[PDB]
From Swiss-Prot:
SUPFAM superfamilies: Glycoside hydrolase/deacetylase, Peptidoglycan deacetylase N-terminal noncatalytic region. NCBIfam families: PgAcgDacpgdA_Strep. The active site is at 195 (proton acceptor), 337 (proton donor). InterPro entries: GlcNAc_deacetylase, Glyco_hydro/deAcase_b/a-brl, NODB_dom, Peptidoglycan_deacetylase, PgdA_N, Polysacc_deacetylase_ArnD. The keyword Cytoplasm does not apply. Its EC number is 3.5.1.104. Substrate binds at residue 287. This is Peptidoglycan-N-acetylglucosamine deacetylase. The record marks 311 as: Raises pKa of active site His. It catalyses: peptidoglycan-N-acetyl-D-glucosamine + H2O = peptidoglycan-D-glucosamine + acetate. The gene is pgdA. It holds the Pfam family Polysacc_deac_1.
Length: 383
């Protein structure tokens, strides 16, 4: 027997002596041998700590011989390596656990934690919990592989967090994915959108101006305004613009019962399909007021905005232009109302400014294209 124990100890030294320092002790009835890894000539402190924690809490006082040791592996992130910890218990019966635990490390042996992966730890945790539920941050157990963050498991595409990722930690494949994401994010597109029409006294001039400047827009029209304006609605579509649904009569939809709010929307789908032959399946709630139940009841995408021109409030062409100059960003969806003269009058200067800054004007379907799904809310190209 004694010779058998000696052979186990000799085998482990033959396997593990190099690059490790060997600790030996008894705890209770257990004999323990731990191989702590060196980085250069120094014990990796956070690995020694993880082993010692297991010794305190989980090591049972049985007549056994217990070994701990580690192996270095790649982490899947640039400049980060992992130590996997194996625990083996001999009673000759034996049982081992590989990756009993794992620590992530800089190449020089210092702790790397999940929060360091992100430029914004607070937002990332928020994004992680969100994607997590759909399926301290530093203390989160994780792995990284095949372009996914693995939570302890739960595997989440890394692409979902590119908004808050520290991209310098990405290896080649992920860095090319991030580059593509960044280039798309910096594509200079804007969607002009107009609520509350058609209005026979102003919409025709808006159409003439959009045609002059060789751009398209998206018009969220009221069902009640379609009667008597059918040829105007057809003209909006004939000139290449997109027509969406702005309810029948402009109530606060979230303050109606579910079926009355749904019917405000489907009555408007009905009249638009009758006049145009088709629906874009885009719906913008009056006042931005909507509920989850209404959204989940209808096969439509709900289009909000991120830039309010304030045309409705300022009623002033110079103010409208200033708001556009200061607020418009890549991917913005701009709210205007094609029902009063300040907006009509301001439009040429707004378009000239944005084209002079290098923007492309897009329709909502052009902007959202792949992203558009039933029930969902959209505030901009990306949000
Ligand atoms: Zn085994
Ligand atoms: Zn409106």
């Amino acid at each position: 027997f004694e010779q058998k124990i000696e052979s186990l100890k000799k085998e482990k030294d033959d396997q593990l002596s190099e690059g490790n320092q060997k600790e030996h002790f008894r705890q209770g009835q257990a004999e323990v041998i731990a191989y702590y890894p060196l980085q250069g000539e120094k014990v990796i402190s956070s690995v020694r700590e993880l082993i010692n924690q297991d010794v305190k809490d989980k090591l049972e006082s049985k007549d056994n011989l217990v070994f701990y040791y580690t192996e270095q592996e790649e982490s899947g992130l640039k400049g980060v390596v992992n130590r996997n910890v194996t625990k083996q218990i001999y009673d000759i019966e034996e049982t081992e656990k590989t990756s009993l635990g794992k620590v992530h490390l800089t190449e020089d042996g210092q702790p790397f934690t999940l929060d360091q992966l992100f430029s914004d730890a607070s937002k990332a945790k928020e994004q992680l919990i969100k994607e997590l539920t759909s399926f301290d941050l530093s203390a989160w157990n994780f792995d990284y592989k095949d372009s996914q963050i693995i939570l302890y498991e739960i595997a989440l595409p890394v692409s979902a967090f590119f908004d808050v990722i520290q991209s310098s930690y990405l290896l080649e494949k992920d860095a090319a994915l991030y580059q593509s994401y960044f280039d798309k994010k910096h594509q200079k597109v804007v969607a002009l959108t107009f609520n509350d029409g058609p209005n026979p006294a102003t919409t025709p001039q808006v159409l003439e101006t959009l045609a002059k400047y060789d751009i398209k827009a998206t018009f969220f029209v009221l069902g009640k305004n379609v009667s008597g304006n059918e040829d105007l609605v057809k003209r909006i579509k004939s000139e290449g613009h997109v027509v969406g649904n702005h309810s029948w009569s402009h109530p606060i939809l979230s303050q109606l019962s579910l079926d009355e709010a749904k019917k405000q929307i489907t009555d408007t789908e009905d009249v638009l399909t009758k006049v145009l032959g088709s629906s874009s399946k885009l719906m913008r709630p009056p006042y931005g007021a909507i509920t989850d139940d209404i959204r989940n009841s209808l096969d439509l995408s709900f289009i909000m905005w991120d830039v309010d021109s304030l045309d409705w409030k300022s009623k002033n062409e110079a103010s409208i232009l200033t708001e556009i100059q200061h607020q418009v960003a890549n991917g913005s969806i701009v709210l205007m109302h094609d029902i009063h003269s300040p907006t009509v009058n301001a439009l040429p200067r707004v378009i000239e400014y944005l084209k002079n800054q290098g923007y492309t004007f897009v329709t909502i379907p052009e902007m959202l294209n792949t992203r558009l799904k039933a029930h969902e809310l959209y505030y901009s190209r990306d949000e």
